[PDB]
């Protein structure tokens, strides 16, 4: 069933933050993606068995992160790149500066 | 701004001018499916 | 090497149907009674007319053909209809297309059935390639795709009558009757 | 409105820039026909056409000067052309059509 | 009957209450501008002022209206003959190179077949059309002088309802035309071979039958176009839940 | 019966008050690549359904009297042998009323299976 | 499709006894007897008869929901008088009257012609 | 979530650095090369050519193969391909931007039209917003159409007094007018020419760091030279899926079609420049590659729509995907179809408590809740396991440590069952369970409220009447939604808030 | 509505003809200041001329509609004060039936043309299940 | 579509009374009102059953197969 825009706002109104994440993730879109620690892209080749990862063109074999995002999100980001836009994802609020 | 009317263009103008997103917005945490600075996500619980 | 399997893991049987389920999905074995993935792939839900395509010769793409009433094509229609009409000259574009368009004109006129009327036109595209004593006349092998096209039901033939129609019912029809017997015995 | 299209409008549509640089004359409309493979032309009825997923359409013949078949015009279930237009009550029940 | 061309004409009244010289202009099809009424009138044969204003104002004692027309004359006083009035169009959306001659005919053709197409599309009916343009401008000014209200858009006796007949008619045309044109194509190609009658013919069979079907079957009243939002769902599957429905 | 709900005499309902019939008809059609009505049995494909094929006859059609439900297979189709057969709609269930085997112009095998149920006024039924 | 079976209105299932006696906690000498597969017909008849006893301080009943055929009967009696006996007595008084009703009716019916 | 372990650390996204793909990085990232506009067939033989969707990208037919990453059509984040265009092409979303940059920088030497010398310019350079800088600087030097050699402090700067063009948008191109030869050379008319891509490239490649800074450009994440598409990224199979309706033919996607159109338009161009080059007759194919590359991303502009008669026409172009309502962001990211919901007609029940909700038995049996096997419950839980998914106080599925799922309706795991501690028992929604019940439209906090469950017969959601006005419902046939919290914290958040 | 119908379209020509045979001074020879009290006639949006004494024309026309000579569908509007007479023969005008009240009745006042005698003639057809609806229109 | 056996509200047998009612209309030449009352149908619940029933079955029977 549709848990569209409006239903979300109510949950935000109640302040029900965890429930909101379980609804928009754990029920529906829930996907795991590997990310380059350097260029926030989904360009990591996932070789789960030889622990081999690689980013190529970044040469990351060490600096790689795993995230939990909704598959629709993963699509939006990929479709952006498809349009030459880079949605770089970083795993630290401590902004560079 | 994505979530409202001028989605595509907003992203373009944002990509063009290298915008950094804090990710401290409710609507932004929803897109990434994480807890947001809402009631339950305004404090951190530790041991 | 591509190996794809659903083997339960716990009690390998090598191998048995695991169910498609009705609502839950995941194909749990009636053996170890475990799970495999989450499925999440509805094949019944194909792209309707509301994007899907059923190509029989190569791969269909399309270009231009603008008609949306937003801004008039006028100047731009001729800009793009000429520009796409220049491109259908680069690498032997004509031949299969000419054959299939002329094919749908000769059958439609005699009202040949689409389901098997189109079936024989696929046979022609298999016969136009391969080089086996065709002594090809275009019209000749067309009377083969006029016979197998009428093979759907006796729609217009009475194939002899459609042979007696128009031109070339004799020796050139003989070359063609042979080509069909050779194509049928070709595995 | 449909009887006006069959009887008049339709004949008027044939006569315009019809003559070529071949002229078309009177145009006739038979009662719904069935052109099927493996057999004769059959007289179609509303009921048969609804069950078999057919098009209740009739012969549209033209008189070409230098008689000639041109398409099928789906008929409005009760116009001058439809068999039901004249059918009686007992007839309708026999054609499996609600009176 | 026959084709059913829709080319609206617009007599505009430039200038609001109390502006400097309220001018009256008109919007023609396939022309990238507007032309003051006096000019179209002289282009129709009616040259002199007053003979023009006799086609508009139906009383010489109505100085009020005749006064409003004064600034109209002012525009056209640049042109005094049928040739220049046909020429003030300089054709239009066709222009650049051609000098005269070519353009004048484009104009004649427009005032014949594309301008006020109902009434008559023939040749020698200029006075009938001129008189109507007048009447149009009279109705325009009647509402500009506050003598008569604005036209009521919602008046039902000014609206129509296209049933089975008229719709099928539109379609039948398009498909009968696409037919007649394919005949011209199969007419060609045969550079000779003498007889070529058997080759032609039997086309109308399929083309018309699929077009009559496809529309009545879908709701797209256009055949493979759909870009024509006539697809608005004419021909819907019949309601059958209750007798009354 | 507040806010536009209504209490109904269950006893009248038992006597037939406001019962209705409900027919729903499913339908299906058919170079040397032809579809066929039949009772499939794998080979070697395996693309089949959860539904029960046991109620179907050899022609791939269910006979009238047969009572159906859930996802039961109403028409069996096959084309080496990928299934493409219309089961009954998941929530529905009733009794096969009639089956009809026709020919659409292009010598196609046409099949309409009608299914009948009787719907009795229940608590959520709108009046 | 969620409708219960019609016989669940008078046929006790598994682990359902006609009666369930639970001592009330509010008052003294008070008892809530749950009736299974019974409706107003009994509930109201037993309540009314229980009110005729001059040693009965309280007696009510209630179908807690129309969906399930079951009711509760609360009874409170004077010290020393068991509510269960009050119940019995009621039940008996009920059977007697009905007994009389039966014969008196049967007597009049015979005296009738048609 | 449901996938395999990883030695990679799990993290939360904290920043989103937006930018543009350098034609260098597109190649450095890519794995494909894409030569052929065909898809699968090789003399009929089914597979996939090194053209579209194949060389190293994801797959179809349930094949694990995918850039040595294995995993298969699930957990394969699609991988990006590569595709080199002949003559560089403009990007539809940036045309608008590209004019504004051209009108703001002088052609040839690629310098700003104004320096700190102009006091109006000084004020505009102090502003700290990409939006405001680039807009203020534009409005301040769009008028000027001469590259000043000398300005009063006369001071000296960039030397090349060439006249600037007055740029106008026509279709997918930029045409400019000049004003030169001082009424002696020629006679009167300007020099109307079309500004090609290769020109704009050099200009934008030759502008310096501090001219980027002045404009909304990072130099690292966005250089103006990248608003122009040299190298085009190819989106993997997961963005553009396949599979059909019958099962004997293709059944392809729209994006793929336009990508094939891009390739044909690109191949025929490379053809003319190597073999027979008929000069200014080639440009008729460049604007086609410009049209497809641009149309692949947008098909509502001011030019002309798209194909094809059949399919879903006109096509989609990524724009249509992302676009608000019924598309990604609106109908996929911030509004999803969630699991564990239920909908029915509602009715009044006056014997319910305010805070309850009558859930019809059937819905209770379908809706599940993942509770953890615990000494506090084993008895109750084990008992449910035995009641099975066809009796109300039962259960379906039983989860373990690893992640196996023992379907209970199919044969599960042997005889009397032996529940182990830590396992999870998806158990039917029982009485008193917290649930989020709502009626749409949800324009309130009141439209979304947690209720105590009460499992009843018949198939209608039954609610207390006093709860009527906050959902703004009545029982004329109103339907309502139900959601079941899945976590132990998530329950707490419904019964506490 | 229950009684509404729609115009199907008649030929305009036989009326345009009939007009100029009963006045209808053709628009070619119109002298506005010479005939001020004159009414201007319209057929299907076209101005076909002018006509003094439109009052007699009007009655003639309505009688021909009611006798059956001019198709009943055809609508005829006389805006007396406007000095205009518009005839429509267009296809697609919604229309409805009405009783006629023409006061032509010597035995007192204004009355409906239909009478009790026409009705027992109508009900006479009903009982046989020759007086139709058309016969009430004719 | 046939006479309802037993009225919905009362439950009194009503299916056995249709031909009797039809006869009292046609031949006896009575008014619906009295016809019902002579059949024992005194109360409006058991009365609307017969008065309101449309014997559609008589038209369904006219279909040949
Ligand atoms: Zn990297
Ligand atoms: Zn197993
Ligand atoms: Zn992968
Ligand atoms: Zn310069
Ligand atoms: Zn009754």
The CATH number linked to C159 is 1.10.472.10
| Strand arrangement of the beta sheet that strand H15-20 belongs to | A85-90, H15-20, B20-21
Q: What fold does the segment set H340-366+430-497 form as a domain?
A: Barwin-like endoglucanases (2.40.40)
* DSSP assignment string, C139-163: HHHHTTTTTTTGGGTTSS--HHHHH
Residue J8 near residue J61, CB atoms below 8 Å? no
Interhelix angle B7-16/H95-102, rounded to 10 degrees, is 40
Of H351, H362, H458, the CB nearest to G64: H351
Query: Could you tell me which residues come within 8 angstroms of residue I2 by beta carbon, excluding any fewer than 6 positions away?
Result: none
Cβ neighbour number for residue H417 with a 10 Å cutoff? 15
Nearest CA in chain J to D90: J62
Nearest CA in chain H to F85: H246
Q: Cα separation of A4 and H332, whole Å?
A: 9
Strands G70-77 and G56-62: antiparallel
Q: Cα separation of E2 and E23, whole Å?
A: 37
Residues of F in contact with J10 (CB under 8 A): none
**Closest CA relative to residue H200, chosen from H170, H223, H232, H233:** H223
Query: Which residues partner with F115 through β-bridges?
Result: F24, F96
Give, in degrees to the nearest 5, the angle at Cα H286 between H296 and E94. Answer: 100
Tokens of H294: 């641009």
Question: Considering only CB atoms, which residues of chain B are within 8 Å of chain H?
Answer: 2-5, 7-9, 11-23, 27-28, 30-32, 34, 39-40
Tokens of C15: 């191998």
Strands A31-36 and B20-21: unpaired
Distances (CA, A) of J8 to C98, E100, F9: 73, 92, 9
Residues in chain I: 138
Bond from prior residue into F82 cis (ω within 30 degrees of 0): no
b/e code D2-26 from CB counts within 10 Å (16+ = b): bbbbbeebbbebbeeeeeeeeebee
Tokens of F39: 């009772």
**Closest CA relative to residue H455, chosen from H368, H374, H392:** H392
Query: Could you tell me which residues come within 8 angstroms of residue H468 by beta carbon, excluding any fewer than 6 positions away?
Result: F3, H348, H474
| Summary count for chain I: helices (H), strands (E) | 4, 7
- Residue B22, CB-side half-sphere exposure with 13 Å CA sphere: 6
Give the catalytic positions of F in this structure: 4
What CATH number is attached to the domain comprising J26?
A: 1.10.10.60
The resolution of the experimental structure, rounded to one decimal in Å, is 3.8
Is H104 assigned to a binding site?
no
Query: Could you tell me which residues come within 8 angstroms of residue H328 by beta carbon, excluding any fewer than 6 positions away?
Result: A72, A75, A76, A79, H321, H322
Q: Do E224 and H313 touch (CB under 8 A)?
A: no
Q: Calculate how close chain F gets to H68, using CA atoms only, in Å.
A: 28
Q: Cα separation of D78 and D56, whole Å?
A: 12
What CATH number is attached to the domain comprising A56?
A: 3.90.1800.10
Query: Which residues partner with H273 through β-bridges?
Result: none
Strands (DSSP E) contained in chain E are: 10-14, 23-27, 34-36
Continuous H helices in chain B: 7-16, 26-31
Q: DSSP secondary-structure letter at B17? A: T
Residue E220 near residue E226, CB atoms below 8 Å? yes
Residue H226 near residue H130, CB atoms below 8 Å? no
Tokens of G41: 């017909």
Query: Could you tell me which residues come within 8 angstroms of residue B23 by beta carbon, excluding any fewer than 6 positions away?
Result: A93, B29, B32, H13, H14, H15, H16
Tokens of H122: 């000084």
Number of domains in chain A: 1
Residues of J in contact with F8 (CB under 8 A): none
Q: Cα separation of E110 and E27, whole Å?
A: 12
**Closest CA relative to residue E132, chosen from E124, E120, E122:** E120
Domain with I40, as residue range(s), is 9-90
Is A36 assigned to a binding site?
yes
Distances (CA, A) of F73 to F60, F62, F66, F70, F89: 9, 8, 12, 9, 10
Cβ neighbour number for residue H369 with a 10 Å cutoff? 21
Give, in degrees to the nearest 5, the angle at Cα H193 between H190 and H194. Answer: 150
G16 part of contact set with chain H, CB < 8 Å: no
Tokens of D72: 């099928």
Q: Cα separation of E2 and D14, whole Å?
A: 10
**Closest CA relative to residue G38, chosen from G99, G92, G91, G97:** G91
Is H476 assigned to a binding site?
yes
Tokens of H83: 């595709």
Q: Cα separation of H146 and E90, whole Å?
A: 39
Query: Which residues partner with H170 through β-bridges?
Result: H173
Nearest CA in chain F to C121: F31
Distance J14 CA to ligand 5 centre (A): 9
Residue D64 near residue D22, CB atoms below 8 Å? yes
Interhelix angle H130-141/H119-126, rounded to 10 degrees, is 170
Distance C19 CA to ligand 2 centre (A): 12
Strands H168-170 and H173-176: antiparallel
Cβ neighbour number for residue G2 with a 10 Å cutoff? 18
Question: Considering only CB atoms, which residues of chain H are within 8 Å of chain G?
Answer: 351, 360-362, 456-459
Residue I41 near residue I50, CB atoms below 8 Å? yes
* DSSP assignment string, E102-168: HHHHHHHHIIIIISSTTT--SSS-HHHHHHHHHHHHHHHHHHHTTSSPPP-TT-GGG-----HHHHH
Residue I50 near residue I31, CB atoms below 8 Å? no
Strands H228-231 and H84-90: antiparallel
Distances (CA, A) of E238 to D58, H27, H31, H144: 21, 58, 55, 67
Q: Tokens 């699929």 — which residue?
A: E210
Tokens of C38: 């989450």
Query: Which residues partner with F88 through β-bridges?
Result: none
What approach was used to elucidate this structure? X-ray
Residues of J in contact with D99 (CB under 8 A): 59
Bond from prior residue into H419 cis (ω within 30 degrees of 0): no
Q: Tokens 């302040």 — which residue?
A: A15
Residue D9 near residue E176, CB atoms below 8 Å? no
Distances (CA, A) of A89 to A68, B13, F20, H80, H219: 12, 18, 60, 17, 19
Phi/psi for H283 (5° steps) reads -50, -10
Residue E45 near residue E83, CB atoms below 8 Å? no
The distance in angstroms from the start CA to the end CA of chain C is 29
Cβ neighbour number for residue H301 with a 10 Å cutoff? 16
Distance H217 CA to ligand 4 centre (A): 21
Of H38, H171, H307, the CB nearest to C76: H171
Q: Cα separation of I99 and I96, whole Å?
A: 11
Residue A38 near residue H364, CB atoms below 8 Å? no
Q: Cα separation of G68 and G64, whole Å?
A: 8
| Summary count for chain C: helices (H), strands (E) | 7, 0
Q: Cα separation of H393 and H384, whole Å?
A: 6
Calculate the CA D32 to chain-centre distance.
5
Q: Cα separation of H293 and E12, whole Å?
A: 44
Continuous H helices in F1-127: 10-14
Q: Cα separation of A45 and H75, whole Å?
A: 11
Q: What fold does the segment set E1-152 form as a domain?
A: 3.90.1110
Ligand nearest to the CA of H161: 4
Domain with J8, as residue range(s), is 1-65
H472 burial level (CB within 10 Å; 0-12, 13-18, 19+): middle
Report helix, strand or coil for I5: strand
Phi/psi for A6 (5° steps) reads -55, -50
The three state secondary structure string of H164-231 is CCCCEEECCEEEECCCCHHHCCCCCCCCCEEECHHHHHHHHHCCCHHHHHHCCCCCCCCCHHHCEEEE
Query: Could you tell me which residues come within 8 angstroms of residue E7 by beta carbon, excluding any fewer than 6 positions away?
Result: E29, E114, E115, E117
Distances (CA, A) of G21 to G48, G52, G88: 19, 22, 14
Four-CA torsion H254, H260, H263, H268, nearest 10 degrees: -130
Number of domains in chain J: 1
Q: Do G2 and H458 touch (CB under 8 A)?
A: yes
Where is chain F discontinuous (C–N over 2.5 Å), named by the preceding residue? 30, 79
- Residue D55, CB-side half-sphere exposure with 13 Å CA sphere: 19
Q: Tokens 């009703």 — which residue?
A: G101
Of E202, E225, E229, the CB nearest to C109: E202
Q: Cα separation of D18 and A54, whole Å?
A: 73
Residue A73 near residue A29, CB atoms below 8 Å? yes
* Pairs across E and H, CB distance < 8 A: 3
Tokens of E103: 């353009």
Q: Tokens 């595709």 — which residue?
A: H83
Of A15, A73, A86, the CB nearest to B32: A73
Domain membership flag for residue A69:
yes
Q: Tokens 């002579």 — which residue?
A: J38
- CATH of H5-88+256-297, picked from 3.40.50.300, 4.10.860.120, 1.10.760.10, 3.30.465.10, is 4.10.860.120
Calculate the CA A64 to chain-centre distance.
13
Query: Could you tell me which residues come within 8 angstroms of residue H422 by beta carbon, excluding any fewer than 6 positions away?
Result: H372, H373, H400, H401
Q: Calculate how close chain C gets to E229, using CA atoms only, in Å.
A: 9
Chains G and I make contact, 3+ CB pairs within 8 Å: no
Tell which phi-psi region holds residue F101, choosing left (phi > 0), alpha (psi between -120 and 50) or beta: beta
Q: Do D1 and E180 touch (CB under 8 A)?
A: no
Tell which phi-psi region holds residue I107, choosing left (phi > 0), alpha (psi between -120 and 50) or beta: alpha
Distance J8 CA to ligand 5 centre (A): 6
**Closest CA relative to residue H258, chosen from H376, H388, H92:** H92
Tell which phi-psi region holds residue D64, choosing left (phi > 0), alpha (psi between -120 and 50) or beta: beta
Q: E186, E196, E227: best mutation site toward chain C, by most C Cβ within 10 Å?
A: E227
Query: Which residues partner with F110 through β-bridges?
Result: F102
Chains H and B make contact, 3+ CB pairs within 8 Å: yes
Report helix, strand or coil for J8: coil
Q: Cα separation of C132 and C126, whole Å?
A: 11
Residues of D in contact with F107 (CB under 8 A): 36-38
* Pairs across C and F, CB distance < 8 A: 25
Ligand nearest to the CA of J45: 5
Chains H and G make contact, 3+ CB pairs within 8 Å: yes
| Strand arrangement of the beta sheet that strand H168-170 belongs to | H168-170, H173-176, H193-195
Distances (CA, A) of I18 to E189, H73, H264, I64, I69: 53, 81, 69, 11, 11
Q: Cα separation of B43 and C135, whole Å?
A: 86
Q: Cα separation of G76 and G80, whole Å?
A: 11
CATH 1.10.10.10 fits H367-429, yes or no: no
Long-range contacts of residues H382-386, Cβ cutoff 8 Å, at least 24 apart = H382/H417, H382/H419, H384/H425, H384/H427, H384/H428, H385/H417, H385/H419, H385/H425, H386/H416, H386/H417
Calculate the CA C8 to chain-centre distance.
39
Phi/psi for D79 (5° steps) reads -65, -175
Residues of H in contact with A40 (CB under 8 A): 15-17
Q: Do B11 and A80 touch (CB under 8 A)?
A: yes
Residue F77 near residue F86, CB atoms below 8 Å? yes
Query: Could you tell me which residues come within 8 angstroms of residue H20 by beta carbon, excluding any fewer than 6 positions away?
Result: A84, A85, A86, B15, B16, H221, H222, H223, H226, H227
Phi/psi for A64 (5° steps) reads -140, 135
Query: Could you tell me which residues come within 8 angstroms of residue H279 by beta carbon, excluding any fewer than 6 positions away?
Result: none
Q: Cα separation of C144 and C182, whole Å?
A: 12
Query: Could you tell me which residues come within 8 angstroms of residue J60 by beta carbon, excluding any fewer than 6 positions away?
Result: J1
Phi/psi for D69 (5° steps) reads -80, 130
Interhelix angle C119-127/C96-109, rounded to 10 degrees, is 140
Query: Which residues partner with H399 through β-bridges?
Result: H405, H424
C152 part of contact set with chain D, CB < 8 Å: yes
Domain with C134, as residue range(s), is 72-187
Element (DSSP H or E) covering residue A54: none
Residue E28 near residue E115, CB atoms below 8 Å? yes
Q: Cα separation of A23 and A20, whole Å?
A: 5
Of C32, C51, C84, the CB nearest to H311: C51
């Amino acid at each position: 069933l549709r848990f569209g825009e409006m239903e979300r706002d109510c949950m935000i109104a109640h302040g029900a933050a965890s429930f909101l994440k379980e609804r928009l993730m754990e029920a529906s879109d829930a996907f795991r993606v590997h990310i380059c620690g350097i260029c926030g892209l989904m360009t990591v080749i996932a070789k789960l068995n030889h622990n081999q990862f690689e980013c190529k063109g970044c040469d990351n074999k060490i600096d790689i992160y795993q995230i939990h995002i909704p598959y629709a999100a993963k699509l939006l980001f990929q479709e952006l790149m498809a349009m030459n836009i880079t949605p770089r994802l970083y795993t630290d609020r401590s902004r560079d500066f | 701004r994505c979530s409202f009317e001028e989605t595509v263009e907003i992203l373009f103008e944002a990509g063009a001018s290298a915008e950094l997103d804090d990710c401290r917005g409710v609507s932004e945490n929803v897109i990434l499916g994480q807890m947001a600075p809402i009631g339950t996500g305004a404090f951190d619980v530790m041991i | 090497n591509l190996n794809i399997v659903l083997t339960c893991p716990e009690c390998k049987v090598y191998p048995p149907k695991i169910v498609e389920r009705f609502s839950e999905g995941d194909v749990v074995c009636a053996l170890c009674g475990l799970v495999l993935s989450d499925k999440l792939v509805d094949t019944r839900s194909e792209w309707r007319t509301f994007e899907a395509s059923n190509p029989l010769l190569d791969g269909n793409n399309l270009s231009t053909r603008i008609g949306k009433g937003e801004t008039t094509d006028m100047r731009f229609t001729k800009e793009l209809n000429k520009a796409q009409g220049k491109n259908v000259m680069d690498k032997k574009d004509n031949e299969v297309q000419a054959a299939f368009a002329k094919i749908t004109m000769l059958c439609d006129a005699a009202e040949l059935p689409k389901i098997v009327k189109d079936c024989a036109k696929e046979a022609y595209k298999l016969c136009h390639d391969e080089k086996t004593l065709k002594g090809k006349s275009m019209e000749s092998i067309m009377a083969a795709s006029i016979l197998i096209g009428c093979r759907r039901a006796e729609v217009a033939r009475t194939f002899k009558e459609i042979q007696s129609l128009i031109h070339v019912k004799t020796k050139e029809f003989g070359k063609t009757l042979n080509i069909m017997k050779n194509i049928l015995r070709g595995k | 409105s449909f009887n006006q299209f069959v009887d008049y409008t339709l004949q008027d549509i044939i006569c315009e820039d019809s003559t070529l640089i071949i002229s078309f004359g009177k145009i006739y409309v038979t009662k719904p026909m069935v052109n099927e493979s493996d057999g004769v032309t059959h007289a179609l009825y509303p009921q048969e056409a609804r069950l078999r997923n057919l098009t209740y359409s009739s012969g549209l013949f033209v008189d070409v000067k230098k008689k000639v078949f041109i398409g099928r015009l789906p008929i409005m279930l009760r116009s001058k052309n439809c068999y039901l237009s004249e059918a009686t009550e007992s007839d309708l029940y026999k054609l499996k059509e609600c009176p | 009957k026959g084709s059913r061309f829709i080319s609206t004409l617009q007599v505009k009244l430039y200038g609001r209450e109390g502006s400097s010289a309220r001018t009256i202009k008109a919007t023609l099809p396939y022309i990238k501008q507007d032309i003051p009424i006096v000019i179209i009138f002289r282009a129709l044969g009616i040259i002199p002022d007053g003979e023009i204003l006799e086609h508009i104002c139906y009383d010489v004692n109505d100085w009020q209206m005749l006064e409003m027309l004064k600034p109209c004359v002012e525009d056209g006083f640049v042109i005094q003959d049928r040739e220049t009035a046909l020429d003030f169009i300089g054709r239009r959306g066709t222009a650049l190179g051609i000098k005269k001659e070519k353009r004048i005919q484009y104009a004649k053709d427009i005032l014949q077949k594309e301008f006020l197409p109902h009434i008559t599309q023939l040749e020698g009916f200029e006075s009938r059309k001129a008189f109507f343009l007048g009447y149009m401008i009279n109705r325009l000014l009647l509402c500009a002088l506050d003598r008569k209200d604005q036209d009521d858009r919602d008046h039902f006796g000014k609206k129509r309802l296209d049933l089975a007949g008229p719709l099928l008619a539109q379609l039948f045309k398009t498909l009968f035309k696409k037919l007649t044109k394919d005949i011209f194509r199969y007419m060609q190609r045969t550079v000779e071979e003498a007889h070529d009658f058997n080759m032609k013919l039997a086309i109308n069979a399929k083309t018309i039958t699929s077009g009559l079907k496809y529309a009545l079957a879908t709701g797209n009243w256009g055949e493979q176009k759909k870009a024509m939002s006539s697809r608005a769902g004419v021909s819907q599957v019949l309601n059958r839940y209750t007798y009354s429905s | 019966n507040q806010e536009d709900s209504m209490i109904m005499n269950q006893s009248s309902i038992d006597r037939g008050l406001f019962r209705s019939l409900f027919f729903r008809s499913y339908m299906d059609q058919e170079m040397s690549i032809t579809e066929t009505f039949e009772k499939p049995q794998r080979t070697n494909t395996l693309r089949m359904k959860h539904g029960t094929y046991d109620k179907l006859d050899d022609d791939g059609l269910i006979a009238p009297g047969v009572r159906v439900s859930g996802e039961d297979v109403i028409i069996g189709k096959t084309t080496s042998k990928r299934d493409a057969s219309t089961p009954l709609r998941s929530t529905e269930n009733g009794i096969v009323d009639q089956v009809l085997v026709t020919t659409n112009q292009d010598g196609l095998k046409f099949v309409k299976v009608r299914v009948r149920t009787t719907k009795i006024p229940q608590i959520g039924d709108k009046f | 499709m969620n409708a219960p079976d019609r016989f669940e209105l008078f046929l006790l299932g598994e682990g359902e006894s006609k009666l369930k006696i639970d001592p009330d906690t509010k008052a003294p000498n008070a008892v809530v007897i749950t009736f299974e597969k019974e409706d107003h017909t009994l509930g109201n008849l037993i309540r009314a008869e229980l009110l005729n006893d001059r040693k009965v301080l309280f007696a009510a009943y209630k179908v807690e929901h129309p969906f399930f055929a079951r009711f509760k009967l609360r009874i409170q009696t004077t010290e020393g008088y068991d509510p269960k006996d009050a119940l019995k007595n009621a039940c008996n008084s009920i059977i007697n009257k009905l007994g009389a009703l039966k014969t008196n009716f049967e007597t009049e019916w015979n005296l009738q012609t048609l | 979530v449901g996938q395999q372990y990883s030695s990679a650390p799990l993290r939360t996204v904290k920043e989103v650095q937006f930018g543009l793909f350098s034609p260098e990085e597109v190649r450095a990232i890519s794995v494909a090369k894409i030569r052929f506009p065909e898809t699968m067939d090789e003399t009929q033989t089914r597979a996939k050519i090194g053209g579209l969707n194949d060389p190293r990208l994801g797959s179809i037919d349930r094949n694990l193969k995918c850039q040595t990453c294995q995993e298969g059509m699930n957990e394969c984040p699609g991988h990006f391909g590569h595709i080199d265009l002949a003559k560089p092409v403009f990007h539809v979303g940036f045309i608008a931007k590209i004019k504004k940059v051209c009108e703001c920088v002088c052609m040839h030497c690629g310098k700003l039209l104004l320096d700190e010398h102009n006091e109006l310019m000084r004020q505009a350079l102090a502003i700290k917003d990409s939006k405001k800088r680039f807009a203020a600087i534009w409005t301040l030097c769009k008028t000027k159409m001469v590259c000043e050699t000398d300005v009063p402090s006369l001071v000296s700067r960039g030397g090349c007094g060439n006249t600037q063009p007055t740029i106008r948008k026509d279709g997918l191109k930029l045409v400019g007018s000049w004003k030169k030869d001082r009424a002696t050379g020629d006679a009167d008319e300007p020099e109307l020419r079309v500004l090609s891509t290769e020109e704009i490239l050099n200009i934008f490649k030759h502008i310096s760091v501090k001219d980027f800074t002045s404009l909304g450009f990072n130099e690292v994440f966005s250089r103006p030279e990248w608003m122009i598409l040299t190298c085009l990224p190819v989106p993997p199979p997961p963005v553009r899926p396949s599979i059909s309706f019958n099962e004997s033919q293709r059944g392809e996607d729209d994006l793929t079609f336009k990508l094939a159109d891009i390739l044909k338009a690109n191949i025929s161009l490379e053809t003319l420049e190597h073999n027979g080059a008929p000069h200014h007759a080639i440009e008729e194919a460049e604007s086609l590659l410009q049209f497809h590359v641009a149309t692949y991303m947008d098909n509502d502009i001011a030019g002309q729509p798209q194909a094809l008669q059949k399919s879903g026409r006109p096509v989609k172009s990524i724009r249509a995907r992302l676009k608000g309502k019924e598309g990604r962001i609106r109908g996929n990211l911030m509004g999803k179809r969630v699991d564990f919901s239920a909908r029915t007609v509602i009715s009044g029940d006056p014997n319910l408590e305010l805070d309850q909700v009558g859930v019809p038995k059937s819905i209770a049996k379908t809706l599940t809740y993942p509770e953890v096997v615990t000494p506090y419950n084993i008895d109750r839980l084990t008992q449910l396991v035995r009641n099975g998914p066809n009796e109300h106080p039962g259960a379906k599925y039983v989860i373990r440590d690893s992640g196996d799922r023992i379907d209970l309706r199919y044969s599960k795991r042997a005889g009397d069952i032996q529940l182990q501690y830590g396992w999870k028992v998806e158990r039917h929604i029982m009485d008193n369970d917290p649930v989020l019940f709502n009626r749409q439209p949800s324009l309130h906090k009141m439209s979304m409220m947690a209720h105590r469950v009460k499992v009843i017969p018949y198939s209608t959601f039954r609610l207390n009447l006093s709860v009527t006005s906050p959902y703004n419902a009545d029982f004329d046939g109103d339907e309502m939604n139900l959601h079941v919290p899945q976590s132990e914290e998530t329950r707490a958040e419904l019964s506490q808030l | 509505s229950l009684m509404s119908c729609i115009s199907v379209g008649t030929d305009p020509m036989p009326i345009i003809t009939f007009l100029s045979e009963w006045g209808m001074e053709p628009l070619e020879d119109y002298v506005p200041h010479q005939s001020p009290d004159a009414t201007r006639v319209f057929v299907n949006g076209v101005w076909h001329g002018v006509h003094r004494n439109p009052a007699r024309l009007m009655e003639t026309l309505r009688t021909l509609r009611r006798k059956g000579d001019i198709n009943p569908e055809v609508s005829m509007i006389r805006d007396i004060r406007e000095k205009e007479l518009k005839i429509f023969t267009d296809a697609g005008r919604v229309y409805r039936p009405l009783f006629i009240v023409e006061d032509d009745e010597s035995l007192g006042h204004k009355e409906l043309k239909v009478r009790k005698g026409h009705i027992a003639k109508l009900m006479a057809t009903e009982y046989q299940d020759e007086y139709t609806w058309s016969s009430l229109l004719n | 579509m046939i006479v309802p056996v037993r009225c919905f509200s009362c439950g009194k047998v009503v299916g056995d009374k249709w031909e009797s009612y039809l006869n009292l209309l046609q031949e006896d030449e009575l008014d619906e009102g009295t016809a019902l009352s002579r059949l024992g149908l005194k109360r409006y619940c058991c009365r609307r059953m017969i008065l309101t029933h449309v014997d559609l079955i008589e038209k369904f029977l006219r279909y040949n197969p």
